[PDB]
Amino acid sequence: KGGLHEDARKILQYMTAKDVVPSSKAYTGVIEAFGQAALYEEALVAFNTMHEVGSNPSIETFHSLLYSFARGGLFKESEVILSRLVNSGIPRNRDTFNATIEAYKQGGKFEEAVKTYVDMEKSRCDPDERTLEAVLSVYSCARLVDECREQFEEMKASDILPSIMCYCMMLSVYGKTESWDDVNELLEEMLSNRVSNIHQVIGQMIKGNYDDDSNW
């Protein structure tokens, strides 16, 4: 979780030095740590070693890789997992779909990203808050001001109070098109924000109010 790959490697070596065969869950944590540090080579070694010791990967293991690949935009490796999930008897859950959108987005495949969101709704499922944030980053990245607006107000149309990440993406799409009117409109929303403290501080510090020694 914290991305301490060095400590994770020492745990695995300590277990092996004591003739202890680590569990399938224990390796998945090691695979998680390497993906946090973008060490794909060492992550796939641990994935390979799981089959060697008989600790076959679980569904969570195929998610540690997908999120690790999603951050780097390695949709070629993401499709390998997806093509492996179908024949492994694992149906595509919502978490798998989020990583696919995130991987395609970071890889620059905007058309294939929205298609996954288009094909996701056909297969029913239930998009969560991150899925809306996953598809919002796609439209924000490809400078879609009107599409982002329709994505944003629907986030609050269900009384969800979108997180600070979605707010920062709105400032990007407005700042990319130099729409200084909408930037000031959204900043005032973050300035009051009586419910959430993180928006207020981050919104205030964007304008430069908190750029002092004591105010930092």
Binding site: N48, T49, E52, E77
Partner: peptide
């Protein structure tokens, strides 16, 4: 006569591709 003189590494370690 005929009785004389007593008569897996490299597996699960492939390229992910």
């Amino acid at each position: 006569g005929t009785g004389f003189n007593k008569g897996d590494i490299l597996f699960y370690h492939r390229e992910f591709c």
